[PDB]
């Protein structure tokens, strides 16, 4: 899954 948080 793409992790969208920095």
């Amino acid at each position, epitope marked *: *899954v*793409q*992790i*969208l*948080n*920095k």
Partner: antibody
Amino acid sequence: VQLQQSGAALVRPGTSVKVSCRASEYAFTNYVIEWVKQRPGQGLEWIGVINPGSGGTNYNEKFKGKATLIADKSSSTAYMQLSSLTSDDSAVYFCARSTYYSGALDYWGQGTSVTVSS
Amino acid sequence: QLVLTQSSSASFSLGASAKLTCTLSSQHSTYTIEWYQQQPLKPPKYVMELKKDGSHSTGDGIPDRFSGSSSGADRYLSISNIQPEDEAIYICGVGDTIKEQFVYVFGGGTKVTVLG
């Protein structure tokens, strides 16, 4: 909403440069700051990201040990140090704003032109 | 090996329908990407966010002739009624956390010439 970058810099080869990115009309610590190099013909090269609430940083592998990203909450200013410069470091460098929650670089500085020359 | 594939150049006739392809690496075929527009001596402009379903969120000052769509690993920027003003390098970008590190990757960009 603006990102105000420092002026054109002349750097001698084998020396370092520090360029600045000041947050204007938004909450500095509520967005990350990303740093981007203009490529020679077309396109962009990601350098890294500073989380100013965290002091946390990540870098493109290639820029590890080359770029250091700093954030000064007090002055709402992000800094990028680039070390031991050669002619390949002669480029326009941008800072860009991004949320903690989405990839978008939604606002960009005007750019800083770095000339590395003897 | 998060990689975005774009053709270096694209040509379109004035007034025509323009579609640019940005292809994700297969393992990242579901990822959301961003579209940027770059004209010379200007900073890049944020164009839109584009998810795997074709749903998109366009940035400020982007005209409505600009839209986005998807099919598998492919992410599309569509410009209906292409204008001289739309000549630019269009770059896609994509973010992820890999080996516990945030990374953003750019495609090589597509230089768009408007013909006629």
